[PDB]
Amino acid sequence: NRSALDFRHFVDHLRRQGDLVDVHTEVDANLEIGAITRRVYERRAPAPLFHNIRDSLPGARVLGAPAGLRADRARAHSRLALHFGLPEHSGPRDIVAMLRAAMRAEPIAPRRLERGPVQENVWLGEQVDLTRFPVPLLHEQDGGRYFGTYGFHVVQTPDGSWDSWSVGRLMLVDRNTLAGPTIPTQHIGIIREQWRRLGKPTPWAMALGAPPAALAAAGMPLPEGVSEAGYVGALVGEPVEVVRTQTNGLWVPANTEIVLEGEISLDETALEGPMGEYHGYSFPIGKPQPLFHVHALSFRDQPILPICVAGTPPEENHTIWGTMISAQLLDVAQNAGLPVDMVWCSYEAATCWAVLSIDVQRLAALGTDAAAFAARVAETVFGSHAGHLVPKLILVGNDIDVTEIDQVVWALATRAHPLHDHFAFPQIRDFPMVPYLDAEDKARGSGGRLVINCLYPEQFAGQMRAATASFRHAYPTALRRRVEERWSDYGFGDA
Amino acid sequence: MNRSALDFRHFVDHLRRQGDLVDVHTEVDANLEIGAITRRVYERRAPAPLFHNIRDSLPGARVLGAPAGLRADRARAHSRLALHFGLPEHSGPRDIVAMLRAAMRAEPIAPRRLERGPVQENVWLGEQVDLTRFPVPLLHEQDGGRYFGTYGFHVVQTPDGSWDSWSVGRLMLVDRNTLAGPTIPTQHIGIIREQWRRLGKPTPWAMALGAPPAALAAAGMPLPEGVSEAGYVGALVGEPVEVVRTQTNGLWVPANTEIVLEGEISLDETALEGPMGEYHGYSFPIGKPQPLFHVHALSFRDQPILPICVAGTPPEENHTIWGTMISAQLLDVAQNAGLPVDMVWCSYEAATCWAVLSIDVQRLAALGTDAAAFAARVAETVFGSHAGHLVPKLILVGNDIDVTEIDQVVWALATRAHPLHDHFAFPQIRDFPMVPYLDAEDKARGSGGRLVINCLYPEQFAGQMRAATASFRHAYPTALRRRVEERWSDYGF
């Protein structure tokens, strides 16, 4: 709870539980930091807090892998769980039930403070130089250095009636200019347009090293006019504390490590990217994006710049956003009357697929078949904001545990018939970032969507052609419990 | 590792010696419990269990479960499996594959004939034969009977004695001295059965259980008709298997075999056999009539060990032995054909229902082909072989990934296989009949289950790649990777 609301306390928390390594060695923000953090995701090592970054502002720090996973199976997701207030042994299923709970908790208004820690140091106008920060070049093939890879943008509607928080990347352009994507169909883009329809640039701020739970809220889809900041309070049962910015009347979390302030240019662009992205790839060509002019910034003493070195799994895009998507999607399916009892975007599939666990008893009641169930499933799923982001759906019965990739592969290989179980929906619009889309797909706007059925035909009539020959399903309950409790007297200890 | 490879008893002491064997002294039940533990052993990837205290069974008789299952330790995960091919504990997929292919090219060594062997320490003749006295397990709840043979092979010899055969096979328990199990009509044992049947005679037979680890594996070699498995043990481990004559029918069986059965495969008698959980992870509900195997005598070692396979969800002996052996065969089929494949791997996790083919994209580009042509080509070549006949689905991916690691194959499949272009079905190529997802239309057509999934990006056929990979290995220069690994403890890890 104190970790969810305070990034610095979040860090001392990880240190306390031994999920942090303090790197005292001088490291280089040119590639080295990224290379270390990359190996950290892949080896599932403690999160590194880099204490000495070459040629940087003295005291400026960097936190790699803020939601990477741990090598400990029992505590694998403790870092990621900590962004939701959740404890060390929280698994996928614990975190989803927590997430669907939050999704129906009353939001709590952000507590307004006069003052805060992010205000300890202020740079105004000409005193602003972003290059003084340990700004990393995260992958050797990136088209520049990224100031923002672990924060959200803050913008407000012209009449001030509502706030938006949204995650995005920001490339370092120069000492007081950044640039990055701004999606028109989203709250930030929608609000830009409101200031455009007034002839004005958009007042902006970015929070970096914001409360872990504030980062989390900054990704949830919500109706226009609705503010993300109250859903921190829904998540953790406590309001996020905010202070107004120095410059532009926006509200930012009191204890953010670094806040940038300024405006998003109406017309100015810079060639932004490319960057190695969540899907595991680094495309070679960048595209123009709006300039972000930094007119002022402020930071806590010894500011920690958290980063995300995106790529092959598992990194924060899979761990944080994949997990949240799986919750929202589980909530979307149940709501519309679909026989789904769990959804997991396997980290190993880099958020390019979500697996749907199916209660085949409830499925039998629908009196339907694969093609029809597959079409109905696609519309519900892809017609939502979370499911717009995942191009492939796998429908499997609930005898397997869909958080286990090994079990999904078994079902995938043994149940999906080449002739009957491959349902393309090439007219459902794509999420453009999907790596396998070709030029025809992108010009058209669709072609990438697909549902893969692993639900045997007789399963729709509530039947099954064969029992699963596993420990769980091939032996009676009394025997299984006998073997479980007696396991260590057999001579196994811990298998 | 040839002493473990050529002697089951030594193989067992070895496993104990390394911490890969648990001696169960708790009294257990041959009814389901033995299998329930062993099933859990495969799945948790625990040390192999040696069962000493079995309810109402022959004293001194023990049981070994998970003979070739995996270990939870990632660096020695394949050690138990590797002992079967006489390999070191740190052996893995590619090491074992390269070992197999060399062995397929290696010359057989004639099995060494002994007059006596430990398998003769106990002999039961005729009415003394009571197969029920062994701790014969019921392995899964929905099984149609108890299984005596799930980790051993049949010995049959051609009527003129110019060659014999070793074939792995399941034998259900029928009564005192009768078993039943499938005789594949096209295999060496069905071929020979037919050879004796044209003489109006049943087929003299034996089964070796607790046979040398390399003998069991050699039974799965690709051999033309007229050639014997037994000499390919020597192909495998550089040493010949030692063999003695059976007590009653003049057949050759390995000398140190834990338990040997002797008798004949009936001409026309059947019993309803099965069902049983099989390699694919499922236990189908119906039993099928299968030939009788009259056991007229059996011999066994002092304190015999009966190895078992509790077949089902991966990874178990079907996947780790036969799966590993198939991948190697498929690597040969592909390379002998001209396909730009540097590795094939039948993912254990996929229960031998797929093989991931590692494509060399520099070599692919030279072909000047496309997805549809390549797919069809790889398909005729692979499914047209004896090994590839047994695998319904093939995945084609670039060799930038380890096709050996399932998490990388999954990444490749999710991010590179396109729903509209890369799903090439081959509905008219004969199926292997046991693939779990077929339907009655398929089984009556005899085909319809085959597929090649293509994860080669379209540009890879011209030699390009749309995007680099964002990982530790591929987003950073070698020099910097080296520094990070060198300074790893310096950073404070």
Author numbering:
A (entry chain B): 2 to 496
B (entry chain A): 1 to 493
Copy out sentences from the published article reporting this entry, exactly as the authors wrote them.
Manual inspection of crystal packing and analysis using the PISA server showed that PA0254 forms a dimer, with the subunits related by two-fold molecular symmetry.
The three (P3221) or four (P21) polypeptide chains in the asymmetric units, corresponding to a solvent content of 48% or 31%, respectively, are well defined in the electron density maps, except for a few residues at the N- and C-termini and several disordered side chains at the protein surface. The final model of the asymmetric unit of the monoclinic crystals contains residues 1–494 (chain A), 2–496 (chain B), 3–219 and 221–494 (chain C), 1–493 (chain D), one sulfate ion and 249 water molecules. Noteworthy is also the absence of a bound metal ion in the P21 crystal form, which was obtained without the addition of MgCl2 to the crystallization liquor. The structures of PA0254 in the two crystal forms are very similar and result in r.m.s.d. values upon superimposition of Cα atoms in the range of 0.7–1.2 Å between the various subunits. In PA0254 crystals of space group P21, there are two such dimers in the asymmetric unit, whereas in space group P3221 crystals two subunits form a biological dimer within the asymmetric unit and the third subunit forms another dimer with a subunit related by the crystallographic two-fold axis.
